[PDB]
Symmetry: D2
Subunit: 108 residues, 4 copies
Amino acid sequence: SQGIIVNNMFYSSGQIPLTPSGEMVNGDIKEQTHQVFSNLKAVLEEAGASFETVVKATVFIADMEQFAEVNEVYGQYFDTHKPARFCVEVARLPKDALVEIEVIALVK
Amino acid sequence: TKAVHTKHAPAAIGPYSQGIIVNNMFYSSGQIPLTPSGEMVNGDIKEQTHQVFSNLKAVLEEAGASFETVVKATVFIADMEQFAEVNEVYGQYFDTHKPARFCVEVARLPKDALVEIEVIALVK
Amino acid sequence: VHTKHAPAAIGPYSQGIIVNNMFYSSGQIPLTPSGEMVNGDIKEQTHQVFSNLKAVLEEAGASFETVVKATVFIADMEQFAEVNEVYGQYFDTHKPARFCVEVARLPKDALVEIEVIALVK
Amino acid sequence: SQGIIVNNMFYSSGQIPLTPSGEMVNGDIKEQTHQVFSNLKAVLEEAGASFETVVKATVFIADMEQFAEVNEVYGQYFDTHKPARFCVEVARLPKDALVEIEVIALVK
Ligand SMILES: [Cl-]
Ligand SMILES: [Cl-]
Ligand SMILES: [Cl-]
Ligand SMILES: [Cl-]
Ligand SMILES: [Cl-]
Ligand SMILES: [Cl-]
Ligand SMILES: [Cl-]
Ligand SMILES: [Cl-]
Ligand SMILES: [Cl-]
Ligand SMILES: [Cl-]
Ligand SMILES: [Mg+2]
Ligand SMILES: [Mg+2]
Ligand SMILES: [Mg+2]
Ligand SMILES: [Zn+2]
Ligand SMILES: [Zn+2]
Ligand SMILES: [Zn+2]
């Protein structure tokens, strides 16, 4: 699975910049972040949630200096409701991933 | 053009408003935009953020830490749309060093306060 | 069953915030109705904290059963076990999905402080 | 490979109940938890840290009812030293994994 639902709340696993072919997406951190968001969109919908019901997002990043660029993409998908809480953490990510995002969302 | 913000003098450090040191790590209390005379600093969210950073610097130094040793910052904010402005000030104190973790939360803050920040830092 | 404590009268700035469907409490401390800190061991303080939590949850249209996260602040991590004995009396059949404990500088005479996140029904 | 070191802090990846041969340990959540701690010990050691310099632990489990049993074991390795921050949270773990722990420790 791609997460767990407990007590009306979906706790996703981390979504990475993976395309449906199994390759890491081509391009810069923005391109990767867009793919992370396509992957989140699908797991959120599957769970009965959406970008508008995310209460917390956690951004795992290879380099904290790249956060401004991730955040530009983040704001396009969370353009109706910015999550009330977010965290950003430097982490060791899978090979060629520059960004990974997990979310906590209310299930309607 | 080079841009500087004039550094604010810090609030007086109270005995329960500083923080605690455990196992070489300093865990600050949340610092709010109070000036040396105990009132909220004048001005917008950026001015309030500058005051918070001044107050942080004071408590970090008292604890034997500094901005360079901050490994986590949590920003408590009245309104998430004001994050961009807070982060503009954040980047002036955490310029050459960015803490490895940071979090932002919408929160209920004391009257007139638009921002509060707490830090975790390594005691050298 | 422990004697219920009388909740403090909590001011507008100490009763937290609702953002969309979620209530985010401020940290509740062992304050009594008379404005003084509980005089008693950490378990009595924790019971006080829980009655203050009960009051702020109910005013927000939430309850202990809708708490999805709790964070306990304590001066000494050695005291966690006793706080947790009390925690389990209020969070008995329902256990919040996330739970943290942190060492912190607390207000004068407070041995424990608790914040919660809860769904507004 | 596993985790990362930033500014004197080691941030481990989540350690699961796998033996050195890659097999999921036999037995209850307590036995699994002991294996997670052997695994944690190895990665802390590699990073130049120890249980004594762990400043935060996060425990992942499938159901929060499992916590008291995990914590009995946690208290054996974190006895005279108790990490200053401790979180527990529900998550989707790997097939057959009942428990997963990640730590943050000071690198002396
Ligand atoms: Cl873009
Ligand atoms: Cl400065
Ligand atoms: Cl850092
Ligand atoms: Cl400025
Ligand atoms: Cl953290
Ligand atoms: Cl829950
Ligand atoms: Cl009791
Ligand atoms: Cl060890
Ligand atoms: Cl510690
Ligand atoms: Cl055992
Ligand atoms: Mg939209
Ligand atoms: Mg908090
Ligand atoms: Mg984590
Ligand atoms: Zn694209
Ligand atoms: Zn100023
Ligand atoms: Zn009592």
